[PDB]
Amino acid sequence: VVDPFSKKDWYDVKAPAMFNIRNIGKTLVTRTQGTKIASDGLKGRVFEVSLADLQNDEVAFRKFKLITEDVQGKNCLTNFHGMDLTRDKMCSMVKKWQTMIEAHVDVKTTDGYLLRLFCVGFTKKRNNQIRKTSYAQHQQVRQIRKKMMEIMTREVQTNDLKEVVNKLIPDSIGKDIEKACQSIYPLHDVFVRKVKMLKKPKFELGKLMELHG
Amino acid sequence: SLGPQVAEGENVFGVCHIFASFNDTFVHVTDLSGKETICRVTGGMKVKADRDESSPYAAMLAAQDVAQRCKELGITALHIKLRATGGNRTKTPGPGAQSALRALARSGMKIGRIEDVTPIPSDSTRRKGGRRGRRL
Amino acid sequence: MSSKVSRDTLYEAVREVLHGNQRKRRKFLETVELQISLKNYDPQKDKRFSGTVRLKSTPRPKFSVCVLGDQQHCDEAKAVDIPHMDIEALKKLNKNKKLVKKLAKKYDAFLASESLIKQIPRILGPGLNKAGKFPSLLTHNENMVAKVDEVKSTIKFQMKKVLCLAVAVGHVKMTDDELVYNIHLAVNFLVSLLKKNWQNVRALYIKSTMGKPQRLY
RNA sequence: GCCCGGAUAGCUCAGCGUGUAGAGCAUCAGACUUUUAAUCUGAGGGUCCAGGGUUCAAGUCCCUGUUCGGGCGCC
RNA sequence: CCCUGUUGAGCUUGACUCUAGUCUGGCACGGUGAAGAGACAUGAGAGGUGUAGAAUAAGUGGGAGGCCCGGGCCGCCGGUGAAAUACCACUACUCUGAUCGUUUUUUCACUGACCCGGUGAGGCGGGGGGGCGAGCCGGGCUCUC
RNA sequence: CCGCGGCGGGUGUUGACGCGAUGUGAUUUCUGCCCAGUGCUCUGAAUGUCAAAGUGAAGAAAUUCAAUGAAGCGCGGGUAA
Ligand SMILES: [Mg+2]
Ligand SMILES: [Mg+2]
Ligand SMILES: [Mg+2]
Ligand SMILES: [Mg+2]
Ligand SMILES: [Mg+2]
Ligand SMILES: [Mg+2]
């Protein structure tokens, strides 16, 4: 017989400080009424935020995910949790009469998160090509996923979590594999399709705050 | 029912979930987490005939009520997650979609981003039905 | 539902509740009535409550009587201001006229003598047993001595199925010294016409036209 | 002995104090080029028995004629 | 063997009258703290359809003109029904809620009675020093350690 | 499961591949239909009947009358190696 929506407070959620826009939106929590804590039932919340509403002029077919970790009061602070690829894009990129290449590898950064990274690469039809197939071999595939496993670890073993984001806001890896695999067989549609965090470290409090200035 | 914002400065976002079967149609408006909900109404609550649980007019009679229950609480913009039945079963969203989206966009909201969240399996199990299949 | 000068729950003495001239919310004459609530007296039972009490103070209603009779009461009361009439007034008042501007009606008190008992319950029975003008043995109809009383301030009262009694007692136009001889005979005979049970007098009102009650003791 | 519910057309059977419903049998027709199956009207009703009070009773109360639950027991 | 006796034993169950055990209620030993579910009492607001009829006249007992401003809207007689609606109420029914009492209330809570397990009754809780190491704006030490 | 009894005792120095209570009788082969009855069990305020106690009223009181009313039988589902 009572409306329970006046028993709530709206909070805000922020981003780390290598992006542009800080605000994401508002998320209501119950008051701390007796035992249950409004910081507690809000802290474990995940925000699916597309990158073109986090930047000014970048692509829109990439998404990030941001959990919450700490309560400041009308302020949640967020950390990187993973990256997704839109079903618009991936299904608008897989088409017949071309060859699909996938890969996946695990890596631990210098402070430790156990990132799992996936990838994909499609072969490109040439300019004057009249042969319809444009298939690859199998030894040229295995000599391609050897390079993608060499590169994701090589770009990741020697830095922290703050700088691989700056190596994922552009397409700097897909550019690199496209130009270090153009020698064997010319591929055009290269992405890292999912980055997943496995095992987060100890909750040190102000490495985040360093990520908020 | 409270609001801390200013109108034209920003748009307060929520998010909906447009479930669309061949016999029933959900609309479930939640928040950015999805964990916290706002309102939920089905097609089946409004029409007293189970052979048109999912008529397109039965989504309009509930979508107008959702945007009517939400304007008292202060939401201007919505994201959309569209969703079929999914799985090993069919994957075509039924007819209760394209007249319920227009039905609330016409009813005065600010439509944001549009995507698909239909649960496509990588490798299905066996669908219910024989090798000769449901024949009739 | 209200009356601004007198409160209903205060119990004024038998002369202090004659403060009723302050009830004048209406120009005309109020029908001062009574709504008493009998308690522990079931109207379902064989225990009857239908009788007469002659008051004094001529409460000024208008009275129209159709006495019916075939006796020596034709040569006993035909000078005493009543339209007494023979069986031609039964052929007349039989409800053949349910029609325009005239009815076999418009008489506040009928009569059944012992010679016309197999007529007025026969001829005018379903037409007079429901408006109340049906004569009987607890409605006190011999009307050789009591018909002048049915002219006077005599009144009749009977039981009701929702556990009450309604009867007219006065009119708020008269003086207080006549309303005290309406209060004495009003509170006197309900105990004797009420039989031995849970307490008798519970909810006594004074009523009017657009009015509210006021309780006494 | 205490309390309790039950009886309506030829079988099962509806009834919302202001009117006797229904399904299945028996007839006569219609639909089909002709049989089957389905379609519709019609015939049958004393609302288990007497009273009540009510404007109005199948309907609430009352008892008697018929079936049944249950707890009880000093001639 | 068969019968009789007002003679008995062993067994069985729907024989008659009783019993250990077990199921359920009540009173006690038996305390300390908050929330919630009622039994209504005083007393508040809402509604009613065979039509007839100024409506949906649920039933009151009358009243024969007020009401509201000498003026205007309505009769009780009509208009028409089983009772008539101008004229105020009381009395029912159920719905809803405040109310104080009423009261029978159920889950969460503490530890001290009581009960259980373990040990040769062997390192408990706070607070310190020492450590991974830190909001590092080093420091008061922070969840584990 | 024992026992007149208690913080009593066996199964038990045991723990579901284990204790305890039953009907059939090797293997091969098959094991049919019936849940109305007598049993058994489950949903029970979905309620007709249902003590003591604690409650209300009338009485000078002993008393008398009312509300409420646990299990189980009743009513409703499941079960034939
Ligand atoms: Mg024929
Ligand atoms: Mg003998
Ligand atoms: Mg013997
Ligand atoms: Mg026996
Ligand atoms: Mg066996
Ligand atoms: Mg059986």
PDB file of N, CA and C (backbone and C1' of nucleotides) and ligand atoms in Angstrom, chain E residues 13-16, ligand 4:
ATOM      1  P     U E  13      -5.096 -60.176  14.921  1.00  0.00           P
ATOM      2  O5'   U E  13      -6.514 -59.475  14.888  1.00  0.00           O
ATOM      3  C5'   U E  13      -7.030 -59.027  13.656  1.00  0.00           C
ATOM      4  C4'   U E  13      -8.537 -59.008  13.642  1.00  0.00           C
ATOM      5  C3'   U E  13      -9.197 -57.755  14.179  1.00  0.00           C
ATOM      6  O3'   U E  13      -9.265 -56.698  13.245  1.00  0.00           O
ATOM      7  C1'   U E  13     -10.287 -59.674  15.030  1.00  0.00           C
ATOM      8  P     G E  14      -9.350 -55.193  13.789  1.00  0.00           P
ATOM      9  O5'   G E  14     -10.857 -55.014  14.274  1.00  0.00           O
ATOM     10  C5'   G E  14     -11.892 -54.675  13.361  1.00  0.00           C
ATOM     11  C4'   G E  14     -13.200 -54.406  14.066  1.00  0.00           C
ATOM     12  C3'   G E  14     -13.692 -55.553  14.933  1.00  0.00           C
ATOM     13  O3'   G E  14     -14.452 -55.049  16.021  1.00  0.00           O
ATOM     14  C1'   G E  14     -15.279 -55.118  13.270  1.00  0.00           C
ATOM     15  P     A E  15     -13.944 -55.191  17.532  1.00  0.00           P
ATOM     16  O5'   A E  15     -14.913 -56.302  18.127  1.00  0.00           O
ATOM     17  C5'   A E  15     -16.225 -56.461  17.615  1.00  0.00           C
ATOM     18  C4'   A E  15     -17.168 -56.988  18.659  1.00  0.00           C
ATOM     19  C3'   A E  15     -17.057 -56.289  19.994  1.00  0.00           C
ATOM     20  O3'   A E  15     -17.815 -55.096  19.989  1.00  0.00           O
ATOM     21  C1'   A E  15     -17.066 -58.619  20.319  1.00  0.00           C
ATOM     22  P     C E  16     -17.210 -53.733  20.571  1.00  0.00           P
ATOM     23  O5'   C E  16     -17.542 -53.743  22.126  1.00  0.00           O
ATOM     24  C5'   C E  16     -18.845 -54.044  22.588  1.00  0.00           C
ATOM     25  C4'   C E  16     -18.858 -54.366  24.059  1.00  0.00           C
ATOM     26  C3'   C E  16     -17.998 -53.472  24.927  1.00  0.00           C
ATOM     27  O3'   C E  16     -18.598 -52.230  25.229  1.00  0.00           O
ATOM     28  C1'   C E  16     -17.652 -55.707  25.541  1.00  0.00           C
TER      29        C E  16
HETATM   30 MG    MG G   4     -11.746 -55.027  19.033  1.00  0.00          MG
END
